[PDB]
Short mmCIF file of C-alpha atoms in Angstrom, two decimals:
data_model
loop_
_atom_site.label_atom_id
_atom_site.label_comp_id
_atom_site.label_asym_id
_atom_site.label_seq_id
_atom_site.Cartn_x
_atom_site.Cartn_y
_atom_site.Cartn_z
CA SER A 1 -21.98 -46.81 -15.97
CA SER A 2 -20.99 -47.59 -19.63
CA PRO A 3 -23.45 -47.03 -22.55
CA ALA A 4 -24.15 -50.84 -22.47
CA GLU A 5 -24.31 -51.07 -18.65
CA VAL A 6 -27.09 -48.34 -18.41
CA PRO A 7 -29.80 -50.26 -20.38
CA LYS A 8 -28.86 -53.27 -18.16
CA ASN A 9 -29.15 -50.96 -15.08
CA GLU A 10 -32.69 -49.98 -16.16
CA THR A 11 -33.52 -53.66 -16.83
CA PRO A 12 -33.03 -54.56 -13.06
CA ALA A 13 -35.07 -51.58 -11.91
CA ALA A 14 -37.87 -52.37 -14.44
CA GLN A 15 -38.03 -56.12 -13.57
CA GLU A 16 -36.59 -56.22 -9.98
CA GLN A 17 -39.56 -54.74 -8.07
CA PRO A 18 -43.08 -56.29 -7.84
CA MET A 19 -45.91 -55.18 -10.12
CA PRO A 20 -49.08 -57.12 -9.26
CA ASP A 21 -51.72 -56.12 -11.95
CA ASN A 22 -54.67 -56.85 -9.56
CA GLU A 23 -53.41 -54.36 -6.92
CA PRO A 24 -54.45 -51.17 -9.03
CA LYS A 25 -57.59 -51.39 -6.84
CA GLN A 26 -55.81 -48.60 -4.86
CA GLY A 27 -54.60 -46.94 -8.11
CA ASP A 28 -51.82 -47.70 -10.57
CA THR A 29 -49.09 -45.08 -10.08
CA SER A 30 -46.37 -43.58 -12.25
CA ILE A 31 -43.27 -41.84 -10.94
CA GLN A 32 -40.91 -39.64 -12.88
CA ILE A 33 -37.44 -39.32 -11.33
CA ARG A 34 -35.37 -36.17 -11.78
CA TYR A 35 -31.79 -37.28 -11.30
CA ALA A 36 -28.91 -34.87 -10.73
CA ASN A 37 -26.76 -37.15 -13.04
CA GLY A 38 -27.15 -34.53 -15.71
CA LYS A 39 -30.92 -34.14 -16.19
CA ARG A 40 -31.67 -37.89 -16.39
CA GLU A 41 -35.22 -39.22 -16.13
CA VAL A 42 -36.73 -42.62 -15.70
CA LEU A 43 -40.36 -43.44 -15.08
CA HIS A 44 -42.50 -46.43 -13.91
CA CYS A 45 -44.02 -48.05 -10.73
CA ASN A 46 -46.94 -50.00 -9.21
CA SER A 47 -50.00 -49.37 -6.96
CA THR A 48 -48.90 -48.76 -3.39
CA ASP A 49 -45.18 -48.77 -2.79
CA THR A 50 -42.86 -46.61 -0.64
CA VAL A 51 -40.57 -43.63 -1.11
CA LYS A 52 -37.67 -45.86 0.04
CA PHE A 53 -38.61 -48.25 -2.87
CA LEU A 54 -37.99 -45.29 -5.21
CA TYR A 55 -34.59 -44.78 -3.46
CA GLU A 56 -33.99 -48.55 -4.04
CA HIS A 57 -35.04 -48.02 -7.74
CA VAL A 58 -32.41 -45.24 -8.05
CA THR A 59 -29.71 -47.58 -6.71
CA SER A 60 -30.89 -50.52 -8.86
CA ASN A 61 -31.09 -48.21 -11.93
CA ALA A 62 -27.51 -46.97 -11.39
CA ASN A 63 -24.40 -48.17 -9.45
CA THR A 64 -22.67 -44.77 -8.95
CA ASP A 65 -25.71 -43.42 -6.96
CA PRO A 66 -25.82 -45.98 -4.06
CA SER A 67 -22.66 -44.74 -2.26
CA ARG A 68 -23.68 -41.10 -2.83
CA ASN A 69 -25.84 -39.37 -0.18
CA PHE A 70 -28.96 -37.66 -1.56
CA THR A 71 -32.59 -36.69 -0.83
CA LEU A 72 -35.84 -36.61 -2.80
CA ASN A 73 -38.49 -33.88 -3.41
CA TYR A 74 -41.45 -32.47 -5.35
CA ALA A 75 -40.72 -28.93 -6.80
CA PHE A 76 -42.74 -25.63 -6.48
CA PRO A 77 -43.87 -26.15 -3.00
CA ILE A 78 -40.41 -27.69 -2.40
CA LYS A 79 -41.32 -30.57 -0.09
CA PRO A 80 -38.36 -32.73 0.99
CA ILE A 81 -39.56 -36.29 0.85
CA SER A 82 -38.62 -37.16 4.45
CA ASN A 83 -39.72 -40.27 6.35
CA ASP A 84 -38.36 -42.70 3.65
CA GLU A 85 -40.85 -45.43 4.57
CA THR A 86 -43.91 -43.14 3.77
CA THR A 87 -46.26 -44.66 1.21
CA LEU A 88 -46.99 -42.95 -2.14
CA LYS A 89 -50.60 -42.51 -1.04
CA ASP A 90 -49.69 -40.52 2.13
CA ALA A 91 -47.10 -38.27 0.49
CA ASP A 92 -49.41 -37.13 -2.40
CA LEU A 93 -46.77 -38.74 -4.72
CA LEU A 94 -49.35 -40.11 -7.14
CA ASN A 95 -48.38 -39.66 -10.77
CA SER A 96 -46.10 -36.79 -9.59
CA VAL A 97 -42.48 -35.89 -10.47
CA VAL A 98 -39.82 -36.77 -7.87
CA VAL A 99 -36.52 -34.76 -8.13
CA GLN A 100 -33.28 -36.06 -6.63
CA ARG A 101 -30.81 -33.73 -4.95
CA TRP A 102 -27.34 -34.75 -3.69
CA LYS B 1 -60.50 -31.98 -31.85
CA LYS B 2 -57.21 -33.13 -30.35
CA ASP B 3 -57.29 -32.22 -26.63
CA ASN B 4 -53.68 -31.02 -26.77
CA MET B 5 -54.53 -27.37 -27.51
CA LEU B 6 -55.83 -25.08 -24.77
CA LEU B 7 -56.87 -21.46 -24.19
CA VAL B 8 -55.14 -18.95 -21.89
CA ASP B 9 -56.86 -18.17 -18.57
CA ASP B 10 -56.09 -16.02 -15.51
CA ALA B 11 -53.48 -17.25 -13.03
CA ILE B 12 -54.05 -18.58 -9.52
CA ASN B 13 -50.44 -19.60 -8.92
CA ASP B 14 -48.51 -16.33 -8.93
CA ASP B 15 -45.18 -18.06 -9.58
CA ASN B 16 -43.31 -17.24 -12.79
CA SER B 17 -42.36 -20.67 -14.12
CA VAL B 18 -45.68 -22.50 -13.77
CA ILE B 19 -48.95 -23.34 -15.50
CA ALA B 20 -52.05 -24.95 -13.99
CA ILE B 21 -53.94 -27.85 -15.54
CA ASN B 22 -56.97 -29.63 -14.09
CA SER B 23 -56.90 -33.26 -12.96
CA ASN B 24 -59.44 -34.38 -15.58
CA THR B 25 -56.91 -32.92 -18.03
CA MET B 26 -54.13 -35.00 -16.49
CA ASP B 27 -55.90 -38.31 -17.14
CA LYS B 28 -56.76 -37.05 -20.63
CA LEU B 29 -53.04 -36.42 -21.17
CA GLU B 30 -50.47 -38.12 -18.93
CA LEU B 31 -48.49 -35.47 -17.04
CA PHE B 32 -47.47 -34.71 -13.46
CA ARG B 33 -46.84 -32.05 -10.83
CA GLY B 34 -43.10 -31.89 -11.47
CA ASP B 35 -43.33 -32.33 -15.24
CA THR B 36 -41.73 -29.53 -17.26
CA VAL B 37 -43.84 -28.74 -20.33
CA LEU B 38 -43.12 -26.75 -23.49
CA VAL B 39 -45.70 -24.08 -24.32
CA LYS B 40 -45.72 -22.95 -27.96
CA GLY B 41 -48.04 -20.04 -28.72
CA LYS B 42 -48.49 -17.53 -31.54
CA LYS B 43 -45.81 -15.52 -33.36
CA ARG B 44 -43.73 -18.71 -33.53
CA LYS B 45 -42.59 -18.33 -29.91
CA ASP B 46 -42.20 -20.78 -27.03
CA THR B 47 -41.74 -21.13 -23.27
CA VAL B 48 -41.21 -23.81 -20.61
CA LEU B 49 -43.19 -24.16 -17.37
CA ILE B 50 -44.18 -26.58 -14.60
CA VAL B 51 -47.63 -28.19 -14.80
CA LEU B 52 -49.61 -28.38 -11.55
CA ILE B 53 -53.03 -29.84 -10.73
CA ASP B 54 -55.60 -27.05 -10.30
CA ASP B 55 -59.22 -27.81 -9.38
CA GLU B 56 -60.54 -24.43 -10.55
CA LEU B 57 -58.83 -24.64 -13.95
CA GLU B 58 -61.46 -26.75 -15.75
CA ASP B 59 -60.08 -28.87 -18.60
CA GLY B 60 -60.35 -26.82 -21.81
CA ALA B 61 -58.00 -23.93 -21.05
CA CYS B 62 -54.97 -23.35 -18.81
CA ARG B 63 -53.95 -20.81 -16.17
CA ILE B 64 -50.70 -18.92 -16.77
CA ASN B 65 -49.39 -15.77 -15.09
CA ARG B 66 -48.93 -12.60 -17.11
CA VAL B 67 -45.19 -13.25 -17.49
CA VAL B 68 -45.59 -16.58 -19.30
CA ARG B 69 -48.54 -15.12 -21.18
CA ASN B 70 -46.27 -12.30 -22.39
CA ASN B 71 -43.38 -14.48 -23.56
CA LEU B 72 -45.83 -16.39 -25.77
CA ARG B 73 -47.27 -13.13 -27.14
CA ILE B 74 -50.79 -14.24 -26.18
CA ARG B 75 -53.68 -12.69 -24.25
CA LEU B 76 -56.39 -13.94 -21.91
CA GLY B 77 -58.64 -15.77 -24.38
CA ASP B 78 -56.12 -17.02 -26.94
CA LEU B 79 -55.32 -20.59 -27.93
CA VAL B 80 -51.97 -22.30 -27.38
CA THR B 81 -50.57 -25.77 -28.06
CA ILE B 82 -49.08 -27.55 -25.05
CA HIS B 83 -46.73 -30.53 -25.22
CA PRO B 84 -44.14 -32.04 -22.86
CA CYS B 85 -40.37 -32.02 -23.32
CA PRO B 86 -38.14 -34.06 -20.98
CA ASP B 87 -35.36 -34.03 -23.59
CA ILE B 88 -34.35 -30.76 -21.94
CA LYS B 89 -31.88 -31.19 -19.08
CA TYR B 90 -29.93 -29.22 -16.50
CA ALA B 91 -28.21 -26.04 -17.64
CA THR B 92 -24.49 -25.52 -18.12
CA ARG B 93 -24.76 -21.74 -17.99
CA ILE B 94 -27.27 -18.90 -18.38
CA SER B 95 -27.16 -15.34 -19.69
CA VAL B 96 -29.72 -12.93 -18.21
CA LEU B 97 -29.69 -9.13 -18.46
CA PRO B 98 -31.84 -6.52 -16.68
CA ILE B 99 -34.07 -4.28 -18.79
CA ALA B 100 -32.94 -0.67 -18.30
CA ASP B 101 -36.17 1.02 -17.18
CA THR B 102 -36.76 -1.62 -14.49
CA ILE B 103 -33.43 -0.85 -12.79
CA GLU B 104 -33.25 2.93 -13.25
CA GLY B 105 -32.33 4.21 -9.79
CA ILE B 106 -30.51 1.32 -8.11
CA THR B 107 -27.18 -0.41 -8.65
CA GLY B 108 -24.97 -3.13 -7.17
CA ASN B 109 -25.31 -6.89 -6.80
CA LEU B 110 -28.42 -7.93 -8.73
CA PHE B 111 -27.41 -11.58 -8.47
CA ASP B 112 -27.33 -11.87 -4.67
CA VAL B 113 -30.52 -9.84 -4.32
CA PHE B 114 -32.81 -10.93 -7.17
CA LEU B 115 -31.40 -13.80 -9.24
CA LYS B 116 -29.85 -15.92 -6.48
CA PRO B 117 -33.01 -16.46 -4.41
CA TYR B 118 -35.22 -16.61 -7.52
CA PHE B 119 -33.53 -19.60 -9.18
CA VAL B 120 -32.37 -21.31 -5.97
CA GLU B 121 -33.53 -24.91 -5.47
CA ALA B 122 -36.46 -24.36 -7.87
CA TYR B 123 -34.50 -25.58 -10.89
CA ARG B 124 -36.65 -23.36 -13.08
CA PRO B 125 -37.15 -24.38 -16.72
CA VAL B 126 -36.15 -21.25 -18.67
CA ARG B 127 -35.87 -20.45 -22.38
CA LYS B 128 -33.86 -18.16 -24.64
CA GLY B 129 -35.84 -14.99 -25.31
CA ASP B 130 -37.77 -15.30 -22.06
CA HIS B 131 -38.35 -12.20 -19.94
CA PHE B 132 -39.01 -13.04 -16.29
CA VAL B 133 -39.80 -10.93 -13.24
CA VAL B 134 -38.31 -10.85 -9.73
CA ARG B 135 -39.87 -8.88 -6.88
CA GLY B 136 -37.65 -7.57 -4.09
CA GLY B 137 -36.25 -4.38 -2.60
CA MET B 138 -39.51 -2.46 -3.06
CA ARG B 139 -39.50 -2.97 -6.84
CA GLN B 140 -39.78 -5.59 -9.59
CA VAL B 141 -36.89 -6.07 -12.01
CA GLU B 142 -37.23 -7.63 -15.46
CA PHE B 143 -34.39 -9.71 -16.89
CA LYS B 144 -34.24 -11.23 -20.38
CA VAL B 145 -32.60 -14.59 -21.00
CA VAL B 146 -30.09 -13.75 -23.72
CA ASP B 147 -28.28 -17.10 -23.92
CA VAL B 148 -28.15 -20.66 -22.60
CA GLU B 149 -25.57 -23.34 -23.39
CA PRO B 150 -27.89 -26.42 -23.57
CA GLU B 151 -29.77 -25.41 -26.79
CA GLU B 152 -32.77 -22.97 -26.78
CA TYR B 153 -34.19 -24.21 -23.45
CA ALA B 154 -32.68 -25.56 -20.22
CA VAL B 155 -33.17 -25.97 -16.46
CA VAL B 156 -31.53 -24.01 -13.60
CA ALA B 157 -30.31 -26.64 -11.11
CA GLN B 158 -28.13 -25.47 -8.18
CA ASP B 159 -25.02 -26.44 -10.16
CA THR B 160 -26.07 -24.35 -13.16
CA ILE B 161 -23.91 -21.26 -13.65
CA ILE B 162 -25.91 -18.02 -13.72
CA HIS B 163 -24.10 -15.18 -15.50
CA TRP B 164 -25.59 -11.70 -15.23
CA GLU B 165 -23.95 -8.54 -16.72
CA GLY B 166 -24.80 -4.85 -15.93
CA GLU B 167 -25.58 -3.16 -19.32
CA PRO B 168 -29.45 -2.46 -19.58
CA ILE B 169 -31.65 -1.55 -22.55
CA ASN B 170 -34.70 0.10 -24.20
CA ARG B 171 -38.16 -1.61 -24.47
CA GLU B 172 -38.15 -1.23 -28.32
CA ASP B 173 -37.43 -5.02 -28.61
CA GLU B 174 -40.74 -5.93 -26.96
CA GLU B 175 -42.65 -4.10 -29.72
CA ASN B 176 -40.83 -5.97 -32.49
CA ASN B 177 -42.24 -9.03 -30.74
CA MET B 178 -45.77 -7.61 -30.74
CA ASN B 179 -45.60 -5.93 -34.14
#
């Protein structure tokens, strides 16, 4: 992605996915993505979403990544975020860093 | 009192690259389980570690193992300023060397034995000047990070190139850190 394409790439990912401001009844939630792109990090999210929605955010946030195969994790107990549907609530992924590994 | 400065406490998590904050500290300062944070203590020194929610910690002071505690030249019951740095990114290369008295007796492939499994898949956040510890083969070896390519501090992703060399050294340098 070009220097001018990247801000545009983040713009989709920031506005593409629902944030309903009355759904923080289950808790507003903030993800921090650790991309293998070079040490790249983007944050954001809403209430109760899915791990797969983070995978969709990666793809929306950058066009090189969709065709690449990769997995997601949390580091130090090294859990591979398996079961891509799994909600943020069930995976303990509340406010917690998510690393990407190709 | 800005709640960004905390005291050093004993360590529950025995891992090298880690510090433990309490959850009421997390809402008081936005950080996460994977977040890599810069610790800057006394003697104008620094270190980088992973923050992790710890119930026992109690928001006021943080848990750090004796290895982190040493690199900052602090003791149990000393104050340190904590602040996050995501500007740091994955390493290009690293330069660690074993301290002589911790390897007196053995020889051979220190990388395959100690360094390879220690850094693997953990993408540890190291720093130049850091002295870390790896337990294996009925002993614990101490290496010192002599150089990194991505500035003073960087991360050790699987693609990062770990260069170790075999010349060891005297413990005189530690004192010039404490004196």
